Amino acid sequence: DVPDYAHMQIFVKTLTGKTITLEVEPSDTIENVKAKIQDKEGIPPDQQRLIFAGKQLEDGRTLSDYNIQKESTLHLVLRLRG
Amino acid sequence: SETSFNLISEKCDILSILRDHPENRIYRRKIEELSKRFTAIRKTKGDGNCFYRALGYSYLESLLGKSREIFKFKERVLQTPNDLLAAGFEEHKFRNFFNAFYSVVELVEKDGSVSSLLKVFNDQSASDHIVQFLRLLTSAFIRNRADFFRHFIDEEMDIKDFCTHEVEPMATECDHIQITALSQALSIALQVEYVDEMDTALNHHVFPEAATPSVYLLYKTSHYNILYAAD
């Protein structure tokens, strides 16, 4: 048993000005992150759009896929197109 | 001048929309559930402008008979040209749209009725002019706060390009950014009821958070209709 030091925090900013803090692993998928946002905010994953430096985050990819590091900040908008 | 309801429809009891989903148990269930909190509905035309038309009509309709609230909103509407100028819109280009909106506000102020308000919002030219004004004001709000909103745009698209192509033109569908921007631009407290075909619980979103809404909208099949809350 050797320690895993990969666990980190990232931040998610919303249009209300609120900053959410998440407990994640670099190998987490975007869905996992969306699931974590739901636990904190009560927003269903299907209603979430995540953005990192202007790039939309696709569900099946991982945080490390986007070079999202410790203390990184993500942006969250709802899907309300009508 | 014949009476029309092609853009903003007549008001019906909420369970009327069960007729739109005769064979979907999930929709029926959700609609029945909605009826616990909402008594009636108005439909808006499915032309891409549905959100802007709905918010405008329903918010103005909620002002009818409220002299104090009307006056305070009129004062705010009077400051909106300055907002438009600051964002680089030109007075000679926004004039007719601002005019249409100020005119309908005055109609509400001078003891308007639901009936006369409906006549304006069902008049194609005057209704579309009101929508176009709301679109410009939404664009101005975003442009004047580009440093904040740029972080929330995907496909590495420029803010200015976003407003130019997805906020300003008629018939372009709204989304979260537009919605919260307009709500903030006019201080209209809005609640959106989210209704999909997934076998899930209902949820809603309030703009701004924890405000007492004056407008309730039903978001379903990528479309916005107007709800009326029970007492």
Author numbering:
A (entry chain B): -6 to 75
B (entry chain A): 2 to 232
Provide excerpts from the study.
Amongst them is a family of proteases sharing a conserved domain, the ovarian tumor domain (OTU) containing a cysteine protease motif. Otubain-1 and Otubain-2 were the first two OTU proteins found to display in vitro DUB activity. Interestingly, OTUB2 has recently been described to fine-tune DNA damage-dependent ubiquitination and thereby influence the choice of DNA repair pathways. OTUB2 is comprised of a 6-stranded β-sheet sandwiched by two helical domains.
A protein complex of human OTUB2 and Ub, an active site directed probe, was obtained by the irreversible formation of the covalent thioether bond between the catalytic site cysteine 51 of OTUB2 and the ethane bromoethyl moiety at the C-terminus of Ub. Protein complexes purified to homogeneity yielded crystals which diffracted to a resolution of 2.05 Å. The overall structure of the OTUB2-Ub complex shows an Ub binding mode similar to other DUBs in that the Ub C-terminal tail is extended and reaches to the catalytic centre. The covalent thioether bond formed between Ub-Gly75-bromo ethyl and OTUB2 Cys51, and the catalytic residues Cys51, His224, Asn226 and Thr45 are all well defined in the electron density map and within sufficient proximity to engage in a hydrogen bonding network. A comparison of the OTUB2 apo and Ub ligand bound structures illustrates only subtle movements of these residues within the catalytic centre. However, large conformational changes and local re-structuring occur at both sides of the Ub binding cleft of OTUB2 upon Ub binding. The main contact regions within the enzyme-ligand interface are formed by the C-terminal tail of Ub inserting into the cleft of OTUB2. Residues 73–75 of Ub are anchored at the bottom of the binding cleft, forming a 2-stranded antiparallel β-sheet with the α9α10 loop (residues 174–176) of OTUB2. In particular, Leu8 of Ub nests in a deep hydrophobic pocket formed by residues Phe153, Phe149, Phe150, Ile178, Thr181 and His177 of OTUB2. The shorter N-terminal tail of OTUB2 is unstructured and oriented away from proximal ubiquitin.
